Design a protein around this ligand. Structure first.
Ligand code: QKD
Length: 127
């Protein structure tokens, strides 16, 4: 079995900035979710080899994880906050697509997503 290459976290061809909203996404949003007791499955790309999930990347074609998001924020990969918000939402959606309601991993995603929604509700106006 083999894992795909991870999502890119650097691309010198891609225009970048550091907005107040992106700083909030790192300092408040990512930090809050990263320290949570349920963060660990989401802190790096899904290792379908180690987890013995050969169908994971057959089903999930747009993988995303908080390790990738963390590096994107720290490396100033994004142009705007919406790109990063979309990455978080992709991560949660992949979890709900692949897994079953009530699975431990889904309960973990739901807890992180609740905090995500609480923090992005107060995303500062641009700036
Ligand atoms: C981060 C998204 O991870 C996943 O969706 N998978 C698919 C099967 S659940 C498995 C785990 C269950 C409980 C702890 S880790 C993680 C990998």
């Amino acid at each position: 079995s083999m894992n795909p290459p991870p999502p890119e976290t650097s691309n010198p061809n891609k225009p970048k900035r550091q907005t107040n909203q992106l700083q909030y996404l790192l300092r408040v949003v990512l930090k809050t979710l990263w320290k949570h007791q349920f963060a660990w499955p989401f802190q790096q790309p899904v290792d379908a080899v180690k987890l013995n999930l050969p169908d994971y990347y057959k089903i999930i074609k747009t993988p995303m994880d908080m390790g990738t998001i963390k590096k994107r924020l720290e490396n100033n990969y994004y142009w705007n906050a919406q790109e990063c918000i979309q990455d978080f939402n992709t991560m949660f959606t992949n979890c709900y697509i692949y897994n079953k309601p009530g699975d431990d991993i889904v309960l973990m995603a739901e807890a992180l997503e609740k905090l995500f929604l609480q923090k992005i509700n107060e995303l500062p106006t641009e700036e």
